[PDB]
């Protein structure tokens, strides 16, 4: 047991996904505009090959709607006035 990001997050009372987003580029884990290489986009299935998609070639780099809404976008109820 040298060190693990999940262990550190648990010790500090934080979310492992939040820690991963913090320590990996912002564009991967948040709905923000940033360059993405064409290879990552994937290609369909060719006659001698199977289909390729980000969901299978980069599961960790996928965005997270829950964290994105928690951090960036406001909640309507928290500001509702009437």
């Amino acid at each position: 047991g040298r060190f693990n990001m999940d262990e550190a997050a648990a010790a500090l009372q934080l979310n492992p996904a939040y820690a991963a987003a913090l320590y990996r580029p912002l564009n991967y884990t948040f709905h923000i505009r940033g360059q993405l290489y064409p290879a990552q986009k994937g290609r369909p299935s060719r006659p001698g090959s199977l289909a390729a998609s980000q969901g299978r070639m980069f599961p960790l780099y996928q965005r997270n709607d829950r964290l994105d809404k928690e951090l960036f976008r406001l909640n309507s109820r928290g500001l509702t006035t009437e």
Binding site: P25, N27, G34, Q35
Partner: peptide
């Protein structure tokens, strides 16, 4: 090419920062 290589490296660093 001498100064051009350094300029390109700096531009790449800036692009990586801004991406």
């Amino acid at each position: 090419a001498a100064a051009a290589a350094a300029a390109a490296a700096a531009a790449a660093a800036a692009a990586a920062a801004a991406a």
